[PDB]
């Protein structure tokens with residue numbers, strides 16, 4: 001097959017922290033605030 | 040001749056830092072003109088980092104050290120948008136500064152094993168006084184630590200020891216099966232990256248094995264694939280600097296509950312190495328070239344890649 005690789009490859013390679021890459025967008029700062037308004 | 044290198048490994052391991060390092064070592068590096076470009080993203084990552092910690096205080100039920108910081112948090116969200124991709128006000132600098140210096144925010148930062156916080160976070164926040172200045176232009180080391188959104192495949196060209204190198208990085212972007220094949224075809228050597236400091240990360244609701252064992256199960260597939268038999272498998276056990284510091288307080292027994300050795304860096308480092316290397320079903324036909332790297336350390340990466348090149352030379 002060589003297909004079970006492709007599935008687990010772009011799952012494991014797409015791991016790690018997000019909302020931490022790229023330029024800071026308003027939609028990102030909004031969701032950050034929305035969360036902050038609970039705790 | 041022509042040499043094709045494919046970077047592989049878990050997200051947040053070293054892959055995209057390595058590609059940047061090749062530009063710094065074997066290309067011109069980054070020009071002052073190109074450095075100005077990143078000023079925007081530096082500020083973006085700084086704010087993204089502090090946000091991520093604040094957010095995690097929610098999940099971890101960690102209160103602010105000083106009561107007043109809640110208002111600074113609020114100011115951050117108001118002033119953030121105005122970090123208009125090339126301008127950090129002294130107003131905003133102070134806001135972030137005060138948060139990062141907060142006893143509670145620190146308490147949460149130290150528990151970054153309980154959530155997912157980028158490893159470039161501490162680098163920037165500790166350097167605010169330098170970053171915040173109006174006439175700041177990102178240093179070579181600063182551009183190295185910037186975190187940009189991954190698109191399709193990243194590529195870099197360089198000539199080293201009379202060889203034409205082409206290095207590929209695909210990770211993060213969930214790529215088509217037919218675009219994956221284009222990356223495997225005629226690959227000379229795979230450089231698989233592993234984040235040693237990932238050993239103590241605490242399990243999420245979706246996963247069914249710790250992160251190290253996920254990076255392992257991937258390696259067990261790359262290493263023992265029919266596509267890669269006449270291919271050199273290079274293993275970078277990266278983030279060794281953080282791993283050494285982590286192992287001082289959090290035992291490797293958090294990750295391999297069966298580990299009977301001492302909690303010294305050297306023994307644990309070597310033990311992890313064994314775990315990945317042992318996934319090689321073919322020892323009579325294949326050998327894995329392992330290096331303990333620190334991808335953000337230009338000098339260290341230079342040494343390591345030099346050793347890697349020598350392997351490729353006598354294997355053509």
Ligand SMILES: Nc1nc2c(ncn2[C@@H]2O[C@H](COP(=O)(O)OP(=O)(O)O)[C@@H](O)[C@H]2O)c(=O)[nH]1
Nearest residue numbers: 050051052053054055056158159278333334335
């Ligand atoms: N302290 C430290 N940080 C690292 C090391 N290697 C990578 N990092 C940082 O942690 C992140 C690693 O992910 P990166 O290479 O950028 O993208 P990747 O392809 O998903 O691994 C980056 O923010 C790096 O600056 C290391 O050896 N030591």
